[PDB]
Design a protein around this ligand. Structure first.
Ligand SMILES: Cc1cc2nc3c(=O)[nH]c(=O)nc-3n(C[C@H](O)[C@H](O)[C@H](O)COP(=O)(O)OP(=O)(O)OC[C@H]3O[C@@H](n4cnc5c(N)ncnc54)[C@H](O)[C@@H]3O)c2cc1C
Ligand SMILES: Cc1cc2nc3c(=O)[nH]c(=O)nc-3n(C[C@H](O)[C@H](O)[C@H](O)COP(=O)(O)OP(=O)(O)OC[C@H]3O[C@@H](n4cnc5c(N)ncnc54)[C@H](O)[C@@H]3O)c2cc1C
Ligand SMILES: Cn1nc(-c2cc(C(=O)O)c(Cl)cc2F)c(Br)c1C(F)(F)F
Ligand SMILES: Cn1nc(-c2cc(C(=O)O)c(Cl)cc2F)c(Br)c1C(F)(F)F
Ligand SMILES: CC(C)(C)CC(C)(C)c1ccc(OCCOCCO)cc1
Ligand SMILES: CC(C)(C)CC(C)(C)c1ccc(OCCOCCO)cc1
Lengths: 465, 465
């Protein structure tokens, strides 16, 4: 009977733990926090249902489809009732975003010089930032009101400080080969097998919030499987002796109330953020194993603010999923990142005579705004909501959660970060990392790095013989 | 006792007569010529196997796939063994053509200038010839070395005398709506077998020639079904009296029977070319129908010449399906329209130590060439094959067939031609036309117009309370 340690009870760790159990292996999951949900955190209150973390997800990954079926969550899968229409703030007011490439050249959303620069992109065309790349290829307007809002809506980050290579792999490649983005994209998408049937390829959630997914995985784990409040402090792997595959031991705190303890395992799946792996006393044989080589990864800080206005006071409502605020719009009074039209997407999340708005504040464009008092946050949100949707008066209700490290910032030296994760995995056998600082930042992707970590542990525990 | 006469045993007629038969309806097919084959005409002699008519076909039509299955011709369906690569004669020599429109900008088939006009087409952009349209939109080079070779390869016609509207419907529409071809195409190009598509697309044939299809339909039509040499001379429909659905009597001639003959039917599917319908004494009640004003449609004349050179004498062979000769290449010594690489596509069609070349001569660019003597034709073909493929000496073998009316020329007044076909149909009840002067000139299309004509008859057969 082999045992596998899994540090972190986020969607990634739960994915890994689940894929592990259904294959016999006995598992133990250490969770620093008091609740299992990872960045997936749904809350239920006074006639409201909201997500303080991930709000939606997609199944572009085989593993997502697989899990949705295993746990039997199809009936709980919830799609938006509202049309898929996103808006961008331009000069300080919502403008409808173009649904497809054609409308881009056919509408007025772009200047005459931007369209010509796009159309002629096929002819006119290491550490490059998302911003630089797109700039030289399609122009500034397209970086400011298109790719910027997109990055803001994905991690709340800033185009100027993201590795183009690491952020958009599917595009860095095409340039290397084809040389001109426009041409490449066309080449491919215009000329792992699981179930599904291209049925509702859009995004979606689950009745009750994104946390429903995480809970489903937890109902298959015993109280001894899932150890909450037990944050991992140290790791230790002993080799040699009389046996084979090395042995790992975990020192987690709160063994009770301000207590410490240990346990021995055969493999360990690392799922906590890279900035948390650093503050972990890990040792090889008998002498420490210094993580000095771990580059210092930065994070996008931001808080999710929830507000609710009586429909009678929202002068200019918009139909769709929400509004993104281009960092350039700060010079127009808009201080938030963007806001989702929650009750419009999921009307059950609130009373039919009110609007539920999930707003994101802070981000790379303004870190000291994520840490504002609920009051200060309350006004920031109202202020933008007034100017964007014509929201009149006070929020009727306000709540929020602050994430000091919401998303990993795939920066310049991110080419080296990956190297360290690999150096660590190579020098400390049995240890497999599967955070979201590798595969990508999205429920779906982390889920996959979790599964992929589990069967990596599996063919390692079985390579023995 | 439901009598259904189909005039003409071409693919269209045979398709119609087949669709009919498998739905009860007794049928009779009059075929002016000695052999059933329509424009489909295979010849299997001298270790050679060639087609004097249609050489290849496609199943972009549902009816084509249906027929291939009913008659069970899948095993006889034959695809080219050579790579789908076509060449264009330029300045005097073959030039590989871009397989799919996208290498059309990476490749050097077009000038930088011709790409600018193309890429910017989205911004810069009753009758009007195929030539005029394409000219104003993409430039002269694209008309001369792209859309012209295309038309030459489809009907041997000339861009300057073809209705843009009637020739390319799928494109005349997009301009009306979207306004700029390029943009439109993009919004419509990216809007049961295992190798279905690759086969659904990509032209093919059948072991033994295109005629094999025609023959499969003929082995399912008893002796009383197909009447050869029995050319239709007059039509006559009687109404009133004691019954219902009008009558239809055919007066077809004979040579081994002398005089003539008659027969009565309930419906009549016209399949002969519109230029033949004119030379048909047809009458309504008791008084004629005359025709001192029929849309006298013109035709593209041309002959299919067959030659065969010993491989040892073909200096510069090319891999692919063939070569197309832009009409502008006449000022360079090339007098032909194009030639297929017959034994390369189908190596079973000839001895492995020789090359079988199917060349088309004449066409709109030179009518008095399609009527040349086999000798004069033997030289013309040789002359071009030398300059194009480095063919040395005489053909080793020569044969040919001359079609004085190979293809219907969809000219200017073709908007009115269709009106007459409908006037005739809405007029004389029971009579349905289904030639190739309507649906389009290609085996696949005519086959469809035949099927669709059959169940149209079936509706008329019914629709009787
Ligand atoms: C505000 C916000 C909104 C988002 N919205 C979306 C969205 O709409 N769509 C989408 O696809 N993605 C969204 N995401 C991203 C998505 O939520 C994450 O990619 C995903 O949850 C990451 O999962 P994970 O399991 O890798 O990590 P996490 O969820 O971060 O979990 C890691 C776990 O490690 C535990 N841990 C840390 N240190 C220790 C230790 N020493 N010992 C034990 N346990 C430890 C933590 O407590 C935590 O539970 C959003 C993220 C945020 C922050
Ligand atoms: C040289 C050449 C090459 C071609 N190559 C290709 C190719 O590679 N790919 C492709 O897709 N298409 C090709 N085509 C086009 C395609 O073959 C034709 O569009 C199609 O065969 C037309 O079919 P149809 O039934 O309308 O007419 P036809 O085949 O002409 O048949 C009409 C029938 O009417 C009969 N008829 C006429 N008058 C009378 C009368 N008075 N009484 C009784 N019967 C009568 C005729 O004898 C004939 O059999 C080619 C055409 C030609 C001429
Ligand atoms: C995670 N998230 N989602 C949105 C967001 C996304 C969309 C979308 O298009 O999916 C919309 Cl409409 C509005 C948002 F606020 C934003 Br600004 C953020 C972030 F990163 F700031 F926290
Ligand atoms: C019917 N036909 N096919 C070709 C032809 C077509 C292709 C092709 O594109 O498939 C090629 Cl490579 C060579 C030809 F000669 C030509 Br020029 C003709 C015509 F109209 F002149 F009789
Ligand atoms: C390959 C992709 C589809 C991931 C990214 C590309 C560059 C095409 C892109 C990038 C940005 C973009 O802007 C729309 C803003 O909407 C935010 C939605 O979250 C639209 C497309
Ligand atoms: C929709 C079509 C296929 C009718 C026409 C378009 C404009 C796409 C076209 C037109 C011309 C063209 O040139 C290639 C010559 O190929 C000879 C094949 O008979 C390629 C494509």
């Amino acid at each position: 009977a082999k045992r596998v340690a899994v540090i972190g009870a986020g969607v990634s760790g739960l994915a890994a733990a689940y894929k592990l159990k259904i294959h016999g292996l006995n598992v133990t999951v250490f969770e620093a926090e008091g609740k299992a949900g990872g960045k997936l955190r749904s809350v239920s209150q006074d006639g409201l249902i909201w997500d303080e973390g991930a709000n939606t997800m997609t199944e572009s990954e085989g593993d997502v489809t697989f899990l949705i079926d295993s746990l039997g969550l199809r009936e709980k899968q919830q799609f938006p009732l509202s049309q898929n229409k996103r808006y961008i703030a331009r000069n300080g007011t919502p403008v409808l975003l173009p649904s497809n490439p054609i409308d881009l050249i056919k509408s007025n959303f772009l200047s005459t010089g931007s369209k010509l620069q796009m159309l002629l992109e096929p002819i006119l065309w290491s550490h490059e930032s998302v911003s630089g790349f797109f700039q030289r290829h399609f122009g500034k307007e397209v970086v400011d009101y298109l790719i910027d809002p997109f990055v803001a809506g994905t991690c709340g980050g800033d185009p100027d400080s993201l590795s183009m290579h690491h952020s958009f792999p599917e595009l860095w490649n095409l340039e290397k080969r084809f040389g001109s983005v426009i041409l490449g994209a066309i080449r491919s998408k215009l000329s792992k097998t699981s179930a599904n049937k291209k049925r509702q390829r859009g995004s979606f959630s689950f009745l009750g919030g994104m946390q429903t997914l995480t809970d489903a995985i937890c109902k298959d784990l015993r109280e001894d499987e899932l150890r909450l409040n037990s944050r991992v402090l140290e790791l230790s792997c002993s080799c040699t002796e009389d046996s084979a595959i090395d042995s790992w031991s975990i020192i987690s705190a709160s063994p009770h109330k301000r207590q410490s303890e240990e346990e021995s395992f055969d493999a360990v799946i690392m799922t906590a953020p890279l900035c948390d792996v650093k503050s972990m006393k890990i040792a090889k044989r008998g002498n420490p194993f210094l993580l000095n080589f771990i580059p210092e990864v930065d994070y996008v800080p931001l808080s999710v603010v929830i507000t609710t206005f009586k429909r009678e006071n929202v002068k200019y409502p918009l139909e769709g999923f929400g509004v993104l605020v281009p960092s350039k719009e700060q010079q127009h009074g808009l201080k938030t990142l963007g806001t989702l039209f929650s009750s419009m997407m999921f009307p059950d999340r609130a009373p039919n005579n009110v609007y539920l708005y999930t707003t994101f504040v802070g981000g790379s464009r303004n870190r000291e705004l994520a840490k504002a008092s609920r009051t200060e946050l309350k006004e920031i949100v109202t202020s933008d909501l007034k100017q964007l949707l014509g929201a009149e008066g006070e929020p009727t209700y306000v709540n929020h959660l602050y994430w000091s490290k919401a998303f990993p910032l795939y920066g310049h030296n991110y080419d080296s970060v990956l190297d360290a994760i690999d150096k660590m995995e190579k020098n400390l056998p049995g240890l497999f990392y599967a955070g979201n600082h590798r595969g990508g930042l999205s429920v779906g992707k982390a889920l996959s790095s979790g599964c992929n970590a589990a069967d990596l542990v599996i063919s390692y525990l079985e390579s023995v013989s």
